[PDB]
């Protein structure tokens, strides 16, 4: 890690065209001698590179993966990295060594740590949740009962506390993953900011605002006011015609309903796997990245631009069968 | 440079290269470098490929 | 710009109340914290005598009194939430009270997170250490011997992270500590032995595994019967190795205990307030054995009766207990050996006057005499109540009953829009029934909304009240609807139509529901001895803030800023909105600017331009943190108090897009309070207003010129050479901008409280300071005192 607000000079990879949230991965693969040299030294001093963002902000990775494919007489090497520190540039300069300077992260007190009773300050810890309706509001009436000493009240303090926040997103995150209940989920909310982020199928604009965004209860709020809001998502080349919808967003297995995956050649994907949708080739399972399922092309039907991949195989009564794929980077959600 | 003029592969001789050659062809062979779309011809697959994600 | 806070009341509400013997080694001594006050007095036959009142540069938060081995009398220990630590010492020659300063010391760490029971502060029994839980897992110990006079101090570690409460153990062979903590396991109490030679903890004589479920408070009974007892929600237990006892006293189950006092050094009796002001008290029922041992046979707690909801307690003698409160009024009381007809044996002795909570206020001059007096809203629940200030200070009260949430001055009907809530609890019958008569129901006209437009634990009910200007009585009591939650309210003329309006901000509050998805706009009219309904308007979601916008109904729906329309038809009509991304909350306006802010600092310049006839973005400037109250200063400069006690100051730039745009903050200043609400009015320099803190205080802002300014700044620094401090604190210090972890001096601030201390101070001192820049000076701060 780095030094909070302080200013160091990062090597930049020109390979890569990602906008890094931190506590994601990102999958690579290098065949230019370049890009392979840098990845040799980062793991001998710091192992940290950064991913700008298109060139105002970006992030810092730290390599964590290294394979190495010598194969048809020239080395393939497969790196996975991890994103770090947000930061703003300063200066780059292809010699690409840029200056960069560290974004700390803005850490705020309860909404109450300054209302509260210090005869009351005794009362707010909490015997922990049963594993319901009923008890969330013990927790809005206890923790918040200093809200009637301020000119706020009770219910609209709950809409910037962390802890209330979280749980309302994790209780959309089930519908769409049915493995997402128990530890999947960082309890620090600065962290559990950052993995919804990478985690929401949104346009690179919306991508790059949350990133900006100081606070993570404000982040919270922001993640949600997407996740509520934008019940369609479109094709970005046409706008006009919408693709799929939020409702039929599926999680196909444990890496959740969004993961980044790899094509043959070196290019990622991050694909959401829905059930259905609406607006080329023959069922291929070369490369399949679903182990028993069969990849086909699919395009929209306004501007003919890509959309994703559509999967069917037959095996025998394997859940499912009838499922799409449709890469974050082609698709813009909407408001209905 | 010794890349294919296909799946995009690149090699690092030109005997390897053209041992490989001779295996797509099926009247269909330009495959897209980043979404395995099927193309006839290379003006085909210089415009689509443009297209994407770079 | 800059600018110019002094106070201009006092801060009344006690948070910390002890007994002891400072003054005098015979005198009993009855030491009071209002906030950053501290009151002296002394206990006579009658009541409290007052000896002396001193003002410390940093909010109290832990203030025990010890007497160490050969000491003339009882030592003062004081820390504030700037963690500046002082022992204090009683200084009498002849007439010149003086309270010297034995040891100062700051102890904050540079790393450590603040614990979630907040500070605790505890003495060891033979005076040995100051035990001092700063944050979690970290135990600093200043040990007690003369020689520690800058109080350096030694941390130790501590496995456990969720403690509750700690005390000193009474009666042990080493220093040892008692305390409940939390575990994934359940909640225990454990012990530790304090070493100063190791610097740290050794064995503790006891360890019990389990405790009550929401254990809270922990008492170190004294040597006569020795351990501790442990109250918590509906279980009382007392810990002492071996021994052990429970009971479960229904009387107490109603509520949670939150303050305690001994009564006499024995420990057989205790005193034990809760929530709702009731009053306990817990008696050990001790059992004389035959050997000149005393054991412990039961426990025992009787209801005493009912005081103001009690922040701190503590007898004082003959049955006189001083109840110290938060929100409502302090009082002495008598205790009475016989109950009398009703059951309490509680009779009010005294009372004294508790601005604190101020929620809302109003500047007015009902007299018409051009002076300026303050209505204020006051109190929670029971303790709720208006007060009238006037000029000394005449400080009226009004009581309620209830919790008074806005309040607003009409003068087409001479008479006061207030907005008020009342808790009920759910009956088998089927309804709401209340805890007492109060303003609600005990008016002399009712009224329910009926709209219809939308078709046994707390529930809240909203209600409008009417009050007469000169009487202060419950004129008219309007209940909004079933599940309504008011917000705003304002008095202001409708443009054209010269009928004087009362229009309320509603919401829609239900627990399924996290946010606002409908609300109301109701206009009501006051004249005829009677509420009239002249039309409501259904929106959809939470009306924060509304506002008089030159003949057009500003209001706030969530983040839609939006413009309504008094049309000739007696209706509201949608005339344009802005929308935003943040909950507009806030709303002011200073002719045809708007200013918008949230809950998170987010402030928001607009500007409706007439002729566009909308709306349109000025600047913006976002930078998250807890924003209490906002205002406006003039058409360029902003104030507002945010974080922990700060207040901010920002303004418009002085020729790119992106830089008059952004709006640049210049104003830098940690008040001391939390201001819920600003108000212009007034009771050479430009612009007067008024706040209401939580503590009870009100303070005026105004502003000053850059010569002023730049001259007030160089006295503030030459008077903090010769003025003495309580704790020996440096001023700047105490001003500056302190959150949780940002720590920047204060700028674009002076304060009036230290300029005002001129004049107390004497010529050698008066001369000193002016020298190199003295009836100069005096005329300077004789003008400002007008303020
Ligand atoms: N066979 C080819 C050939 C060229 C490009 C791609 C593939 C291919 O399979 N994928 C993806 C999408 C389809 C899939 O399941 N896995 C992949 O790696 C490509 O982008
Ligand atoms: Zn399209
Ligand atoms: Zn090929
Ligand atoms: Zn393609």
Redesign the pocket.
């Known amino acids: 890690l780095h030094d909070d607000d302080s200013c160091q000079v990062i090597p930049v990879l020109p390979q890569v065209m990602m906008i890094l949230i931190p506590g994601q991965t990102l999958p690579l693969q290098l065949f230019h001698p370049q890009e392979v040299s840098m990845v040799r030294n980062l793991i001998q001093k710091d192992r940290t590179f950064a991913v700008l963002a298109y060139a105002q902000f970006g992030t810092t990775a730290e390599i964590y993966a290294y394979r190495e494919e010598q194969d048809f007489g020239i080395e393939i090497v497969k790196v996975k990295a991890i994103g770090r520190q947000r930061f703003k540039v300063l200066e780059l300069r292809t010699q690409q060594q840029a200056k960069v300077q560290i974004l700390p992260e803005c850490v705020l007190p309860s909404t109450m740590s300054a209302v509260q009773l210090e005869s009351l300050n005794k009362c707010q810890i909490f015997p922990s949740k049963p594993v319901s309706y009923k008890w969330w509001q013990k927790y809005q009436k206890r923790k918040f009962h200093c809200a009637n000493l301020t000119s706020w009240p009770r219910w609209l303090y709950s809409l910037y506390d962390a802890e209330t926040l979280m749980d309302r997103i994790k209780k959309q995150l089930r519908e769409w993953d049915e493995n997402l209940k128990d530890d999947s989920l960082p309890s620090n909310p600065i962290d559990f900011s950052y993995r919804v982020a990478a985690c929401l199928p949104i346009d690179d604009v919306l991508r790059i605002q949350l990133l900006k965004i100081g606070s993570a209860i404000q982040r919270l709020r922001c993640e949600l006011d997407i996740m509520n809001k934008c019940t369609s998502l479109c094709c970005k080349q046409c706008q006009e015609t919408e693709i799929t919808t939020k409702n039929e967003i599926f999680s196909l297995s444990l890496c959740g309903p969004m993961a980044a995956?790899?094509?043959?050649?070196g290019?990622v994907?991050e694909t959401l796997t829905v059930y259905k949708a609406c607006n080329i080739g023959r069922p291929?399972t070369?490369?399949?990245?679903?182990p028993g399922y069969a990849?086909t092309v699919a395009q929209c039907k306004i501007c003919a631009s890509h959309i994703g991949?559509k999967?069917t195989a037959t095996k025998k009564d394997m859940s499912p069968q009838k499922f799409w794929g449709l890469t974050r980077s082609a698709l813009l959600p909407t408001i209905p | 440079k010794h890349k294919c003029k296909y799946?995009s592969k690149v090699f690092g001789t030109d005997s390897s290269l053209q041992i490989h050659l001779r295996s797509h062809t099926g009247e269909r062979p330009f495959?897209?470098?980043?979404?395995?779309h099927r193309f006839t011809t290379k003006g085909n697959l210089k415009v689509h490929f443009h297209r994407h994600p770079q | 710009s800059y600018n110019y806070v002094v106070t201009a009341q006092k801060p009344t509400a006690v948070n910390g109340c002890v007994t002891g013997h400072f003054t005098s080694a015979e005198d009993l001594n009855l030491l009071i914290a209002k906030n950053t006050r501290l009151e002296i007095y002394v206990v006579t036959a009658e009541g409290l005598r007052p000896v002396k009142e001193v003002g410390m540069y940093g909010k109290i938060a832990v203030m025990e009194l010890f007497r160490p081995k050969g000491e003339s009398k009882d030592l003062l220990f004081i820390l504030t939430a700037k963690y500046n630590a002082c022992i204090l010492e009683y200084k009498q020659s002849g007439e010149s009270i003086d309270i010297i300063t034995r040891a100062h010391g700051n102890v904050q760490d540079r790393i450590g997170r603040p614990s979630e029971t907040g500070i605790i502060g505890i003495i060891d029994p033979e005076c040995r250490m100051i035990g001092l839980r700063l944050y979690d897992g970290l135990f600093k110990v200043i040990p007690l011997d003369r020689d520690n006079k800058e109080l350096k101090a030694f941390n130790i570690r501590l496995e456990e992270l969720h403690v509750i409460d700690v005390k000193f153990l009474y009666g042990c062979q080493a220093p040892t500590i008692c305390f409940v903590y939390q575990d994934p396991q359940g909640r225990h109490v454990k012990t530790y032995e304090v070493s100063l030679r190791e610097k740290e903890f050794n064995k503790g004589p006891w360890k019990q595994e389990n405790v009550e479920a929401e254990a809270s408070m922990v008492i170190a009974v004294p040597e006569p019967f020795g351990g501790a007892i442990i109250i918590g929600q509906e279980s009382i237990t007392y810990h002492n190795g071996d021994k052990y006892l429970a009971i479960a006293p229904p009387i107490i189950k109603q509520s949670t205990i939150v303050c305690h006092n001994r009564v006499d050094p024995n420990g057989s009796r205790y005193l034990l307030g809760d929530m709702e002001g009731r009053l306990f008290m817990l008696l050990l029922e001790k059992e004389e054995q035959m050997d000149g041992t005393v054991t412990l046979k039961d426990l025992r707690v009787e209801l005493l009766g009912e005081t103001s909801i009690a922040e701190c307690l503590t007898y004082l003698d003959n049955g006189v207990v001083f109840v110290g409160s938060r929100l409502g009024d302090s009082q002495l009381v008598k205790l009475n050996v016989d109950s009398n007809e009703q059951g309490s044996y509680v009779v009010a002795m005294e009372t004294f006057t508790n601005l604190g909570p101020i929620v809302d206020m109003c500047v007015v001059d009902l007299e018409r005499q051009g002076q300026g007096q303050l209505v204020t809203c006051s109190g929670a629940f029971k303790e709720g109540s208006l007060r009238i200030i006037r000029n000394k200070l005449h400080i009226r009260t009004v009581p309620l009953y209830e919790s008074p949430r806005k309040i607003c001055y009409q003068e087409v009907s001479q008479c006061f829009g207030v907005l008020s809530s009342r808790i009920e609890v759910q009956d088998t019958s089927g309804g709401t029934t209340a805890l007492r008569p109060s303003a609600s129901t005990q008016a002399l006209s009712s009224s329910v909304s009926s709209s219809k437009l939308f078709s046994g634990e707390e529930v809240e009910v909203h209600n409008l009240l009417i009050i007469d200007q000169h009487t202060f009585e419950v004129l008219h009591a309007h209940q909004f609807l079933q599940n309504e939650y008011a917000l705003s309210l304002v008095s202001c003329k409708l443009g054209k139509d010269p009928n004087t309006y009362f229009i309320v901000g509603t919401a829609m509050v239900y627990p399924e529901e996290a946010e606002p998805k409908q609300g109301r706009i109701v206009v009501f009219q006051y004249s005829d001895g009677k509420l009239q309904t002249v039309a409501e308007k259904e929106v959809k979601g939470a009306v924060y803030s509304m506002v008089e916008f030159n003949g057009k109904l500003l209001a706030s729906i969530n983040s839609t800023v939006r413009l309504y329309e008094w049309t000739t038809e007696k209706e509201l009509r949608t005339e344009c909105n802005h929308y935003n991304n943040i909950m507009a909350l806030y709303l002011k306006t200073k002719g045809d600017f708007i200013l918008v802010g949230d809950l998170m600092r987010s402030v928001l310049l607009l500007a409706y331009k007439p002729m566009e006839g909308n709306f349109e973005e000025i600047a913006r400037d976002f930078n998250p943190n807890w924003m209490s109250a906002v205002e406006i200063l003039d058409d360029d400069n902003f104030l507002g108090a945010e974080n922990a006690f700060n207040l901010f100051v920002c303004q418009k730039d002085s020729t790119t897009d992106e830089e008059r745009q952004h709006l640049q903050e210049v104003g830098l200043f940690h008040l001391g309070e939390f201001v819920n609400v600003f108000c212009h009015g007034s009771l050479p320099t430009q612009g007067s207003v008024l706040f209401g803190t939580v503590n009870g205080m009100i303070g005026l802002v105004t502003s000053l010129s850059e010569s002023w300014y730049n001259l007030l700044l160089d006295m503030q620094n030459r008077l903090n050479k010769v003025i003495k401090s309580v704790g020996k604190i440096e001023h700047s210090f105490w001003r500056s901008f302190h959150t949780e972890r940002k720590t920047e001096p204060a700028t674009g601030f002076i304060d009036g409280d230290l300029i005002e201390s001129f004049l107390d101070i004497s010529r050698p001192k008066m001369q000193e300071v002016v020298a190199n820049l003295a009836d100069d000076l005096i005329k300077v701060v004789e003008e400002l005192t007008r303020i």
Not at chain 1, 261 to 265: E, I, L, M, R, T
Not at chain 1, 286 to 290: A, G, I, Q, T, Y
């Open positions: 995956y790899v094509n043959p050649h290019y994907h291929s070369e490369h399949s990245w679903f990849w991949w999967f | 799946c495959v897209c470098s980043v979404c395995g």
